[PDB]
Structure 1
Amino acid sequence: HQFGDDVILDDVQVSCYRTLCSIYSLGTTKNTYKLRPALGECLARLAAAMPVAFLEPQLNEYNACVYTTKSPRERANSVEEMCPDIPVLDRLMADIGGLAESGARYPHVIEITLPMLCSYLPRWWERGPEAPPAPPPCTVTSDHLNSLLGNILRIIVNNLGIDEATWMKRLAVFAQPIVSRARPELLHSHFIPTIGRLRKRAGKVVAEEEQLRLEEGELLVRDEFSVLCRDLYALYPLLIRYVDNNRAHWLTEPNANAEELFRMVGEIFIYWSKSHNFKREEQNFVVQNEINNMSFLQTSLIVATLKKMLPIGLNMCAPTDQDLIMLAKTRYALKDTDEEVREFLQNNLHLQGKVEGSPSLRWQMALYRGLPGREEDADDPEKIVRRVQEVSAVLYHLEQTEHP
């Protein structure tokens, strides 16, 4: 209800900020006392109800929101004297930036200090400068949100884990509104290398089980797949909301980087299609966590990534390939290899066309030449059969799993 700005002005700010003064001991000293993630959630809710803007105390005295309103003598004496060891947000940025490359295990301050950033700077960015909505803006930039968000993804990238992690859930769920703005340069910057890191998380690691199948080995690789499936739920729910707010521009402007994302996530789905053990490992966390998976957006998240991106990947391919895509769908019924269907389609390249015979078709790629894509220069036969190779198997697996 956005009542936090005014309804706690008079010494409730001081009393809660005293808890901010004492929060260092919850992490600086550890004898026995576990509750730090739950304490971090309760702590993170204070940033949502943070009236005072403490990015710069001087601009805070410029702004209307505690010394300014009443007489400052009665408050006694300085705003920074309350917490002389306060973490400056620029200094916190440097701290997480240096700590991102290290990425060691809980870095225990990330569980409590990282949700300050997502709970506060998204909460204050629209309020203050670098946000088109009369006194000076007290706060942060949109590029600051972009930079730290690159480090958020880098923190999850470095903290892979080998057997256990139970902290990605709250941090990924908490950092929802930062994905809402999501200026488009970050796709080139971080997400394509990050999804490449997920490709490296695949590529004989997801396929660890099949080498052993050439019962104990399946149990061991299933235990490793627990970490993998948790990492999929770390990266995906940020990606879904980012895809929703940027699929329109990917369709209108054909992005090459989106082409690489389409084939990579399709490779992940192809591993998911035949891997029954991966489906059982997926079944473990959904029933353990009891997540509806409705407000976040059978009700799988991996298939949601595929289907939500599938307009973009289909938009890359031309309409002339559609008849050959039907032929390719029949080709995968034989369970042929990727090279077999590739060459069997490449040598029989004259089967496509049918431009003049069907006027209803002619209208279709009359649009396709009208897109920003150019004429037949980049679309060589190799890229064309590459599109066939991806999409034919994708619709085969999706059509089978559609039948519930």
Structure 2
Amino acid sequence: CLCAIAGALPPNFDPRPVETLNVIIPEKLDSFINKFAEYTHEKWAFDKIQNNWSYGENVDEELKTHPMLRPYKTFSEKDKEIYRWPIKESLKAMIAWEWTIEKAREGEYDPREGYNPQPPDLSGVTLSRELQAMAEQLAENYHNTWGRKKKQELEAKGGGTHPLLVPYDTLTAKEKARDREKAQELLKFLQMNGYAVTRGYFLSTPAKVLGSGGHASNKEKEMIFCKLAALVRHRVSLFGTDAPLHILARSLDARTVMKSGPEIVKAFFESASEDIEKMVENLRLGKVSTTVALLPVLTTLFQHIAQHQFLDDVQVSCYRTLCSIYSLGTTVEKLRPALGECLARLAAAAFLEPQLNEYNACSTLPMLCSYLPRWWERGPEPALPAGAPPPCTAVTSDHLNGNILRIIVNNLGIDEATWMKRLAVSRARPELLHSHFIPTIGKRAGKVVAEEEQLRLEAKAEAEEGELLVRDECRDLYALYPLLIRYVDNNRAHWLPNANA
């Protein structure tokens, strides 16, 4: 669910300060420290100028005076160290992370009584998001450092807790700002100096590729406890698939990879159903738009050869990849000829869902001729062979993408054959799937004879209601007839031409 949330975004404390005091800054950077300390005391005097503060004998807030308000040149270097200390500890903390801080780009309201700094405007500098992460993590350093000192201190005092004694990610954004702003000046002053400063979303997708690597670890499992977690991770891949550009195509290739490693098991079971949802993720892989994916078809051909022998789950996954072929209808060719080979494997002879998969696979005049022969077979109306022919019917619907309209009227005559078949079960439900193909196939005079089949529905309703009159003094046999007749009513939904009426 958290993955769904981040995917929606894509559209006794234990402080860890880095070691600081042990680290050694190069001495030439200390001259830079002179600069940041200079601006530090100058701007600090400047905010005091904002409130009309001035130098005086002693520390007296009510007197509008403060002794430290004296020029930076007046400081002894050791007094400068009092402001250098956060600077040196910060830069040493960065060198412990070995963040680069090096020479590069060229270096650079009534006035009040007393010392008068005229500061460069550091606060206006624009940190880059990588550098914003750097300031975020240095502020995280102030957080963990002054916070670790605060925890060891309060625990030394026998005290309880403080609001800031928290992991840095916890913070409300303005609390992040409380040290982020001090770091900003730390890094904003760096960028204003123009010095190179480095650690030395799409991240969800790259992490998905990392999931593909952990999936290679799952291939290591295919070599055969973590693997169940890999299965829940596959479920996460499904829910992430529900959330679903070239890197995304790379992810599609990863989907082909996981589909293949799953395909090794193709020839507990709920994880195989997760492999089916993973096949839907393969449909998402079809959505993305190297040739290794075509190899998946090559296993499909030999699996098709297994069909000649007459397990089934591999054929179902092939039906799902065929649904991805329907996505191609919403959208290597020799591998399509291999799909024609599997079509021959179905042509040799329950597997009707795989037949529909072939109808999806349809998405060259010889195909039209064999389809005409299939119409000749349609003339014959053992019905299970027609159920196999339903794939040829939907493939014929694919062929329309003319004469195929009148051929579709002949298909309506085949539906009349289905009506004669319907005069008195689950194969009839497969015929209802064929009726969905008729919905794809959607002349009135054929629907007039079909209306005569509706008259057969009237005779059937009459005999059935009369059977209910027998019930007044069993009906379930008439119920299934009412259901197939309801499928014929779905064919009437295909007939919905009302404007012509």
TM-score with structure 2 setting the length:
0.31
**Larger relative contact order, structure 1 or 2 (CA cutoff 8 Å, min sep 6):** 1
Flag the structure with higher helix content.
Answer: 2
TM-score with structure 1 setting the length:
0.37
